[PDB]
Amino acid sequence: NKHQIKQAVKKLYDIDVAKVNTLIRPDGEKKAYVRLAPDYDALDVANKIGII
Amino acid sequence: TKGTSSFGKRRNKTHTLCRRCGSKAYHLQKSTCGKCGYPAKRKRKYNWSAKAKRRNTTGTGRMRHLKIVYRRFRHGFREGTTPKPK
Amino acid sequence: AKIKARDLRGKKKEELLKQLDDLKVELSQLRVAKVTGGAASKLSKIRVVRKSIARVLTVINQTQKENLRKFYKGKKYKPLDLRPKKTRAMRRRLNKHEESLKTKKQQRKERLYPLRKYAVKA
Amino acid sequence: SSHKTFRIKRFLAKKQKQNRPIPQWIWMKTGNKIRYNSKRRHWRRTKLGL
Amino acid sequence: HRSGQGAFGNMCRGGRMFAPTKTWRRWHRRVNTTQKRYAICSALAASALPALVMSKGHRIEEVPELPLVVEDKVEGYKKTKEAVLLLKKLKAWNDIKKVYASQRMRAGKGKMRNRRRIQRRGPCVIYNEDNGIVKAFRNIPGITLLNVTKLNILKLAPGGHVGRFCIWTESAFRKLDDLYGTWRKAASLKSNYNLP
RNA sequence: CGACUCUUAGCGGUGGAUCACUCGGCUCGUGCGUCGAUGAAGAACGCAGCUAGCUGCGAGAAUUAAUGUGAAUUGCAGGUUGAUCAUCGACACUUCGAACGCACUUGCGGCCCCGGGUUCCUCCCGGGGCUACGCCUGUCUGAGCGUCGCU
RNA sequence: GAAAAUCCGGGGGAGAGGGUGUAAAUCUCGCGCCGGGCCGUACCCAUAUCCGCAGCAGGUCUCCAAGGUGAACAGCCUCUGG
RNA sequence: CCGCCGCAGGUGCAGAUCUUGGUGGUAGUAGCAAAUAUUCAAACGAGAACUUUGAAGGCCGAAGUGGAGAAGGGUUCCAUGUGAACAGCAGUUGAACAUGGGUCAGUCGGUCCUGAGAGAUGGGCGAGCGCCGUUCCGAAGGGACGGGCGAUGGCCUCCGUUG
RNA sequence: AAAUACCGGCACGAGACCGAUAGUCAACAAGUACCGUAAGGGAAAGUUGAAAAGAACUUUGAAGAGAGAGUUCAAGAGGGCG
RNA sequence: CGCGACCUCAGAUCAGACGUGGCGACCCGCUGAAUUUAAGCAUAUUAGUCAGCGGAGGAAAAGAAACUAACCAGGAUUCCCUCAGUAACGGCGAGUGAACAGGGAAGAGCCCAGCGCCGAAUCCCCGCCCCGCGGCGGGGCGCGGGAAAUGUGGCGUACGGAAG
């Protein structure tokens, strides 16, 4: 669900989510666009998970 | 206009993918699989096509249960015992 | 740390689930390392972690079902999981006791007229 | 079409991922026989059923 | 590629062969017992004359007597070292040394059908009892062991040619008068049998 | 002398015969003679660091454990208190399928119990267990101007 | 010259509210708080992404529709776009 | 691998409009002629009648050669790279090939409803897989208002949940 | 019960069988590729060498392709190659 | 009117079980053609065969005489040899076509209901305790429940049986 992704993104990355959009790719895997609440920078938590 | 011109109008399917046999034979209006007859409890197999039988029999697939039964047979179907430890 | 299924079994319930998440986070960080595009030394480790998750989850499940079939040992009704799964037709057979049952009339034949050990001269 | 069922989009997903050429280290294996992928499928030529 | 090719008929590629071979071909042949007997008799009498045994190709020049008959001690042999030593002394060994020379590869498809190595036939050692003689001789190539009571036409006369070299034992040789009889005394070990 | 054409030969092409190979068939024989609501056969979809097919496998996903074996695996990397193989008895085994809450869209519920937001409090969200048909023994519950009984 | 889901109005008046109030039940009024999962969504849509073995003069359901001439959505010429 | 003596057969090809595969002559031939049309300069590049940019001349002419969709396709979309094969000349180009990318909904749809109809159970038939039938020969309702006898949640206050 | 049957299944052993147009349709990624709306139809396709030692380096070409050199008993075996 | 029985028939996500579907070489039950043959053809033949449907098992089915015989008699079933291309069937055409005895492989016999006797002498299920088994079995304990006289168990079955 969007609901399961919201509680997953929260619990694994100690962040809170404004909204989740989802699409299922042509490849077949579900991509989630997890918009974050405005008291958290995405670019400052993207470095913490380790993506650059 | 019975050939080339009439093939253009072919744009709505009679069959779709059956969900027993996976084959594109599940007639949407009749709601029966032309291959396996899905809503019918028993498999649609006929003795007049020996070739059609042997395409879809016990050999064909994995036998993910039935292959280990053959392995479990040759020890008298033993249960709840382990081999003796180190 | 090389995780083997001998120094997991003796350990405690919540002690093993701690180690499970200690591996789960380790794996999720290696799947980020796979996509951020580097470290062949880390892409080999991803399999080692996948199997050590499987080792822990097995020993979790092994010790549950060693404890459940100890719990359900004395009882007359144990769950369908714990009952002996062999072939279906083999479960439908008469018990070790039921095949052994003789009628009173047949026990009397066996007593009066037992098949004798004999041997005839030519 | 644009309007799809989830069941068909999973079928079309698998068929895409099968339509990639063999890796160039598969033919360096000891008992290699495969030269190229024979089960490749172009969208003009072979129409994937349905 | 098959669509519209040619599928039935001897001549068609793929296709069925003309008159497919059945398993109810008459494979086996029965011979009259009297005729089977009068083949063993003939196969035995040919072995007596060195003219016919040499013409079968058996190196028997050094051999002391053609109906070579050895002691009943030979039955009690257990090691091949004992068996090989005996043939050196009887001077039947150049017949085995000739088999060794003949050990070549079979020409044709027989190689891929479990008939790869071919060689020659050696002497045929006939024994009454078995106190180990079969164990002691079997590793030596060319030697076939026969019981006297159970003599085979496929082994005494190999190829259908007559006069194989035979090495009798003493106890074997004396049973032939009983098995086959003389012309005045019928066989005691056959229900109703005279010599032809 | 031309060029062209034809014949023969050498050499070179085209083509894949012939021969020699055979981890495949075919045939006969032997021993066994074992599927499934404890979810079969079959199907779908997934699973490898690099991986399409085949094979293996099931979210523990080219495998876990256990035993036997005792140093490999290998296309390229990479990191003996047991590598790898074999065996296989422990454990696990996604979706559909007899296919089982109802529908085939993966669409709608109902019940009971858990946790979180909450401070059981009706919503919400997640998770868990149940909810198919026939039928048997029993159990419970009521039905009948069926047959009576008693007040 | 459709059905049904769905929604509303009315006729009735079983009930319900509290003893002059810190009013009560009750409000289809105005605000405020919380939530809305699952699946499809790219592109072609045709003198080259569909069907006719093909970039096949065939076939394949629609929507929008400028100026001039003119009865005109005719034909002919032109602008946007191609 | 073969000679000799025997044994055995799926044992001898020019044909069957034979079967399968290969190759000729035809022949560098028919052909690459439906819907008016191209031209100049430059750029990249080993290479340009065809690519790209600019300029000219044209065409579709709003019932379009325009802009969007439904069926159907299934990644053909998009960028970059390549020029083997394919795109019946070519190609620096492509819907080819190789890489990477790309489809974000409470409100657009689907889901919901019923239509023609399809189709279980009851029943009926049928040797049987089953078929007929859709309100018909059926004990086809598991749902709300009140109320006692009871129970717990809150200072059991009194209601939620319920027996 | 036994003696009896058994072209499916799990194992095996064997052959006066077939030898890649043969033998199973299938010796190989074969009930695969591909065809049909569907029931169904259904291929072709074995071989470098003892060992990849699979041709470095130079040279012409934009390149495919060459010329040399080199490996090898042999390329008169150069990756669909006895 | 009420309450207690009984009978007959409903409902349960009631406690515990069980069936379905697959494979289908062999096997059991049905159903069942036409090519073909007869130089045509219709009865016959193909053939109770192919296809169709159902049900199994490691084998199945059969099976301990409502038998064969006509003998000096044999003695369940199944299988092999032979009877035998026979007796018989048949547009008496084409064609079809067994059995007994005989030799062998194997060899094994039995049980009810009824009839009657024994105080239902019988069986099932729940709860406790003790063994105890991945074939829920054994022994205690209970005015614990139930089925069963519309007949459970023992004795007994044509070879006769029972009672004293």
The 3-state secondary structure of E155-173 reads HHCHHHCCCCCEEEEHHHH
Burial class (CB in 10 A: 0-12, 13-18, 19+), E180: buried
Smallest CA–CA distance from D11 into chain B, residue: B17
End-to-end, the C-alpha distance of chain A in Å comes to: 27
- Kindly determine whether the C-beta of residue C34 is less than 7 Å away from any atom of nucleic acid strand J: no
Nucleotide nearest to B3 in CA–C1' terms: G52
- Which of chain C's residues have a Cβ under 8 Å away from the Cβ of A51? 32, 35-36
Among the listed residues C33, C19, C34, C26, the one whose alpha carbon sits nearest the alpha carbon of residue C50: C26
What is the CA angle E189-E195-E196, rounded to 5?
145
Burial C53-79 (b: 16+ CB within 10 A, else e): beebeebeeeeeeeeeeeeeeeeeeee
CB B15 within 8 A of CB B24: yes
CB E63 within 8 A of CB E91: yes
Name beta bridge partners: E168: E69, E126
Residue D43: what residue type? W
List phi, psi (to 5°) of E51.
Answer: -50, -50
The residue written with tokens 């001269």 in the block is C121
Distance CA E44, CA E70 (A): 17
Residue E90: what residue type? L
Q: Is B65 annotated as a binding residue?
A: no
> What is the per-residue DSSP string for E173-192?
HTTHHHHS--SSS--SSSTT
Q: Resolution limit in angstroms?
A: 3.1
Method: cryo-EM
Distance CA E161, CA E42 (A): 11
How many residues are recorded in chain C? 122
Closest Cα in chain A, distance from residue D34 (Å): 25
> What is the per-residue DSSP string for E52-121?
HHHHTT---SS-S-SS-EE-GGGGG--SHHHHHHHHHHHT-HHHHHHHHHH-EEPPSGGGTTT--EE---
| Spatial CB neighbours of C56, under 8 Å, sequence gap ≥ 6 | C3, C8, C16, C19, C20, C23
Q: Is B36 annotated as a binding residue?
A: yes
Give D27 CA → F23 C1' in Å: 20
User: How would you classify the pairing of strands B15-17 and B24-27?
Assistant: antiparallel
**Strand G positions with any atom < 7 Å from protein CB?**
36-45, 49-56, 58-60
Q: Is B21 annotated as a binding residue?
A: yes
Among the listed residues E30, E1, E31, the one whose alpha carbon sits nearest the alpha carbon of residue E14: E1
Distance CA B44, CA B18 (A): 13
Residues 82-121 of C with CB under 7 A from strand J: 83-85, 89, 91-99, 103-105, 108-109
Task: Write down which chains contact chain D via at least 3 CB pairs under 8 A.
Answer: A, B
List phi, psi (to 5°) of C104.
Answer: -55, -40
Task: Write down which chains contact chain C via at least 3 CB pairs under 8 A.
Answer: A, B
What is the CA angle C83-C88-C91, rounded to 5?
55
- Say how many CA atoms lie within 13 Å of C66 toward its Cβ: 9
CB D7 within 8 A of CB B26: no
Closest Cα in chain C, distance from residue A39 (Å): 24
End-to-end, the C-alpha distance of chain C in Å comes to: 82
Q: How far is CA E22 from CA A28, E8, E17, E18, E30, in A?
A: 56, 18, 12, 12, 20
> What is the per-residue DSSP string for chain C?
----SSTTTSS-HHHHHHHHHHHHHHHHHHHHHHHTT--HHHHTHHHHHHHHHHHHHHHHHHHHHHHHHHHTSS-S---TTTS--S-HHHHHSPPTTTTT---HHHHHHHHHSPPP------
Task: Write down which chains contact chain B via at least 3 CB pairs under 8 A.
Answer: C, D
Mutate to test the interface with D, among A23, A24, A30 (most CBs of D within 10 A): A24
Residue E4 DSSP symbol: T
Output helix, strand, coil percentages for chain A, rounded to the nearest 5: 40, 30, 35
Residue A35 in tokens: 């918009």
How many residues are recorded in chain D? 50
Among the listed residues C58, C46, C71, C65, the one whose alpha carbon sits nearest the alpha carbon of residue C20: C58
Is chain C in touch with chain A: ≥3 Cβ pairs within 8 A?
yes
Distance CA E186, CA E192 (A): 7
| Spatial CB neighbours of E184, under 8 Å, sequence gap ≥ 6 | none
| Spatial CB neighbours of E69, under 8 Å, sequence gap ≥ 6 | E168, E169, E170, E172, E173
Give E16 CA → F46 C1' in Å: 44
Smallest CA–CA distance from D17 into chain A, residue: A27
Q: Where are the beta strands (DSSP E) in B11-71?
A: 15-17, 24-27, 32-33
CB E97 within 8 A of CB E74: no
Q: How far is CA C58 from CA C54, C55, C61, D38, E53, in A?
A: 6, 5, 5, 40, 78
Nucleotide nearest to B42 in CA–C1' terms: J21
User: How would you classify the pairing of strands E104-105 and E117-118?
Assistant: antiparallel
Closest Cα in chain B, distance from residue C90 (Å): 10
Nucleotide nearest to C96 in CA–C1' terms: J135
C32 vs A51: CB contact, 8 Å cut-off?
Answer: yes
User: How would you classify the pairing of strands B15-17 and E166-169?
Assistant: unpaired
Q: Is B19 annotated as a binding residue?
A: no
CB A49 within 8 A of CB A13: yes
Torsion of CA E142, E146, E150, E151, to 10 degrees: 50
Residue E105 in tokens: 């590869």
- Say how many CA atoms lie within 13 Å of B84 toward its Cβ: 0
Residue C19: what residue type? Q
Q: How many CB atoms lie within 10 A of CB C23?
A: 20
- Kindly determine whether the C-beta of residue D27 is less than 7 Å away from any atom of nucleic acid strand I: yes
Name beta bridge partners: E69: E168
Q: How many CB atoms lie within 10 A of CB E60?
A: 20
Distance CA E144, CA E121 (A): 8
Inter-chain contacts counted by CB atoms under 8 A, chains B and C: 10
Among the listed residues E158, A24, D26, the one whose alpha carbon sits nearest the alpha carbon of residue E146: E158
| Spatial CB neighbours of E148, under 8 Å, sequence gap ≥ 6 | E126, E127, E128, E172, E175, E176, E179
- Kindly determine whether the C-beta of residue E192 is less than 7 Å away from any atom of nucleic acid strand I: no
C89/B contact by beta carbon, under 8 A: no
Nucleotide nearest to E20 in CA–C1' terms: H10
